[PDB]
Design a protein around this ligand. Structure first.
Ligand SMILES: [Mg+2]
Ligand SMILES: [Mg+2]
Ligand SMILES: [Mg+2]
Ligand SMILES: [Mg+2]
Ligand SMILES: [Mg+2]
Lengths: 384, 384, 384, 384
């Protein structure tokens, strides 16, 4: 199960080099040279890596100092053949965004949040990115009267339109993707899930330039079905980038490697992702636990990629199994896929097969045969 | 704090006439004649009532029996003077809806789901209903391959589109509201939150006919901030209806009387509804606990309207207090409604005040003053 | 993976005989006679069955047909070879237990709660039962003032103290087990987790006759690690019985097939039970979903024993693998099993290897090797 | 509503001097002087303060700078009257405890965490502390095979036995209090709830010197009822200490100021604390957010004591209302205090008022009048 560059396996600069700075602890790991990150990930069969601004260039560094990091990072990508499918902007680490970036109560920092994320859009496009991600972790509140949510969404819509107007002006080959999260650090984060994010996009001035960037743990932090949420994002056709990791239950944002936590949800996710034809990157926004040294760093990195391919093979033979194909026909997934009343509204009203002469008891007495179907989905995951 | 018909308080027949039958118990109170319940809320001060079709006419009743129950029900509303603002259909009780109604795996049961809905939509217009609520409690799955999520949404859009074509072909002054729910009775219900519903509406053929009907307990079942959900629903102008009750955490849908559970979330909800000019019905989808009698089902019902009205007084006097206003201004609540960059994108880029000449240390050093503000909101809530 | 009577699998009568009644729908399947349930459970490979006070005999039946139901069941146990390891009381269902059984507010129900329970432990002794289970599904309240939970625990202690008195008086070889559950149908259930139950045991008059009966789903309704709670129960030596089912997320009690939901928690559980040599019954307290016919409830019942045995094979080969034991050496699982201060306290005070001359950074720079260890367990779980 | 030292209000050194450094951001506030915090707290009405060993005295400082940090602080407490009722050991921040303190997988660091706790014990007793808190927030793991919980509970059982032997050896009058937390920083924590801790204490060799220190937020982080959890500790008589904060829903440990979050659970807590006669310190383990400057952290701590005085005032007026006293008797809370069967087990058997002649129908038809009681509690709290 060793990965190939055509797997589109991307990471970030914040994934490893996390140092393990826990809310209740200090650092444990070494500050990873942004160059030496892209080494091992190329040596581990990955394709591409992502980054924030402050992850690549130090905060406050001037142009020719910033330019010195971009060139050192450019030679590393060209020597190892790695790409950069996505870039981001840091709007949470610095204490200036206590009340958010695009939705801050102060107007000064709101305009500073735009200039900071605009200078980065130029860097994102000049590195061959295919999507720009915006994570509004600081956009939230702890008390009620501290933020009018209608006014904050007025500013978030105004901010995204300003960005979309900028990319259309410069003609960059890019599209945005909002990464939702229900809470942390704020008591409640604005646009907390894929549904809240997808609805927000449909009001933006140029909706075709925006998508969603769901992450496994974030939606599982609200008790929601991630394979169901990805399906709604795919059904709307607004799935531009995906963060993969593991998470158990409703707790703090634990960024375990992909495969850990909800293993069944990881199975159905890779099943839906490959069956739908998603050809974007398989990004991993995970953190190796601070329990590890500089040798368990890449074991967690290679682990989430080695996992992804295992469930990919088992979910493929699950759909290719003829015995399961008949169990899906028993579950009547042959129906459900064909239209309900494609004969029209008037034809449905005149049809008594749907009302007067519809034997309600016979249809109700038919078992859906879901258990025998789900057990076959089980045995394919373990191997039997 | 006595409720009046001016407050537009409606309740519903299944609410205060609930069996008391939970998954581990039989019935405590007897069933109620729908007329008995109508006289009842009229004496307390309710303005309207809502109902499922099976709550007014019993399932499997012929024409003469379904047309003798409406007459006794019509005479009750003509006497008490109460109106029917909302109506819904029952597609979860009968064992023919184990797999669902609009997204059932069986092609024939989906049509009866629409034939039973159309018959009740046609009668809702007779009683002067102006919003028809749809709650898909059985639209979902408990295992992965048991339901194609993209195909299920393909049938729910088709379902919803043909009844929008019906109400327009009939000229009924009626729109639709979607009641979202994350789980229960199914393991994972499609369109779980109000955002997933709002994202689903703008893919329908005529999005102006359909809105969201949020309920307190449902959004709190996903760990979400309910007053944040309505603010986004009001932001899109799709708060066609609302259901008011209580919930104490991520548990089962208990549907206790409004005001109980998350008391602070009800204060912020009643503050947002009144301050936004919402004019729809304030309707309680609550179930009195099975431990009560027939004198306790209306001591709890009266507690629903009172808990609202005394919260309406504490929230009004809060935002009307002059001391909270500069306390609000100290939190820069006025600068949040101010447009970030109404000067244009070209003016924002040429303004180095928002970047190089921006002092991030001085902007980060300000105090926000949220806790002094939140304590004033705690004082008006408690009466101190 | 065919189960044998020596695996000692147990199935409740209500388990596969659940007609499918949730708070939103009617029944789906027929009523299973207690006789036919035994013969079908034994053809699949089970070892014994479980019954409630009202699952074997109907409520309010005369003592003539009471012995008939027993003798008619007493036809099917000897003629089959199945057993009855566990018996319990049905102190819910009936409206008499609106507020509870042993901790009701009315003494009317508290005394009847005990007379009904002792009436069944006489039957449990005749059937050779070894563990009598009590589940306080109705003990609690939805409001704060409705129950002085200090006086309530005084009544659970009062009721449980005399139950062990009747057992010690009749010379029965019978022990008790507490089934913890956090919520549903009550708002908050007394003794919500295993720990609260174990603590309640150490305050009763005879803590020797009382243990716990934890269910994998009841503890996961509070986000707790179920393999952790079973480990504490085994460390205290009080795991008299165990309930096996499935549940994914903090929601209503789903009672899914074993292995469904959190499969990782199911893997580390079978690994824990087989490591400590737990020789009790593998009792499955699950409910096949309402979507199944009668053929679906047995393929699901067989699936419970099916995936326990497959998890038993992977967990055994995991710890019996040579390269896994060497990873436990790198993870230092040796030292946690070694005594900390076996040399005494005064030697601990005179040892500077544990304070002054203890290298802080050289001990903090070591890697725990937890992730490479966990992927080794993941490759064994998936059979890679 | 201004508090006095008679109210025993204490605050943590880490509470108001939190600096704001969180998972997603750098520090916001300046580091406060320990001598300053006590001045500021005494002029607000507080009675005492707490401290970790690394909070009062920085890590790695000399023995000369040690008592320099201790003396000037001691001179501050006696010059203003503040005491130190509580103290605890820091066993989480330094990367040495990245696997844990008492139950670390390496023996050399297990003995180190003990030799650090006994030193702060010598100081805690010299300053006049009455309790000492041992919260093992780094006890646990994230993978299944990383921690053998049975052998880990042996190392914690061995740990507390040593420190309890040291207390009885030095002649100190000091008792321990375990502060339980479900999750964070580790995936799953050992002894996650109050019950898990209480059951762990009864196994310890000298259980008289050990109790619980429950946190309001820590218990509802698993959806548990905190007023239910305190009175089980009050039942066992092991509530040596308690922490006051706020939390809204199952998520990361917010620790808002007391009053915020579950306002109703905060009401029922001080109601039980006053009725049960709690004389321990009303300690606050809250953290004012990043948003506040220095003037807000004192207003937040001021409202901390303010919300306790408001709730205690309305809890006393609730249980002293003549109308509530009769409503509690209509709910038959008085019969909950009466013993179930004080006449003996034989009389329980021979009395058929509790069985054969018991009116099961008339007893179930009685209402508990819980809703009217809960409304009176609402009206008393909401000033009506
Ligand atoms: Mg994350
Ligand atoms: Mg509901
Ligand atoms: Mg259960
Ligand atoms: Mg059981
Ligand atoms: Mg805390």
């Amino acid at each position: 199960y060793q990965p190939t560059p055509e797997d589109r396996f991307t990471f970030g600069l914040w994934t490893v080099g996390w140092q393990g700075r826990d809310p209740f602890g200090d650092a444990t790991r070494r500050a990873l040279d942004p160059v030496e990150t892209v080494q091992r990930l190329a040596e581990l069969g990955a394709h591409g890596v992502t980054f924030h601004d402050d992850d690549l260039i130090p905060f406050g560094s001037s142009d020719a100092e910033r330019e010195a990091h971009i060139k050192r990072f450019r030679e590393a990508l060209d020597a190892t053949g790695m790409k950069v499918p996505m870039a981001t902007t840091n709007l949470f680490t610095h204490p200036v965004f206590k009340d958010g970036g695009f939705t801050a109560n102060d107007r000064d920092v709101r305009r500073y949040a735009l200039r900071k994320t605009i200078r980065n859009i130029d860097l994102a496009a000049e590195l061959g990115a295919e999507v720009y991600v915006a994570w509004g972790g600081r956009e939230g509140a702890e008390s009620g009267a501290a933020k009018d949510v209608r006014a904050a969404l007025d500013r978030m819509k105004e901010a995204f339109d300003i960005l979309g107007e900028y990319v259309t002006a410069q003609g960059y080959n890019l599209r945005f993707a909002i990464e939702p999260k229900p809470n942390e650090p704020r008591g409640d984060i604005l646009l907390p899930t894929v549904g809240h994010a997808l609805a927000f996009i449909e009001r933006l001035e140029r909706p075709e330039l925006y998508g969603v960037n769901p992450e496994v743990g974030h939606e599982q932090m609200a008790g929601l079905n991630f394979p169901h949420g990805i399906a709604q994002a795919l059904w709307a056709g607004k799935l531009f980038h995906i963060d993969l990791n593991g998470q158990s239950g409703i707790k703090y944002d634990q960024d375990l490697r992909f495969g850990a936590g909800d293993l069944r949800a990881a199975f159905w996710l890779v099943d839906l992702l490959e069956s739908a034809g998603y050809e974007g990157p398989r990004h991993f926004d995970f953190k190796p636990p601070r329990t590890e040294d500089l040798d368990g760093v890449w074991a967690s990195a290679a682990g989430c990629m080695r996992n992804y391919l295992i469930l990919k093979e088992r979910s493929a033979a699950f759909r290719a199994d003829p015995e399961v194909q008949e169990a899906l026909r028993a579950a009547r997934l042959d129906q459900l896929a064909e239209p309900t009343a494609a004969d029209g509204l008037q034809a449905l009203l005149a049809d008594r097969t749907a009302f007067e002469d519809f034997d309600v008891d016979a249809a109700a007495a038919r078992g859906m045969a879901f258990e025998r179907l789900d057990q076959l989905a089980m045995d394919h995951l373990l191997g039997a």
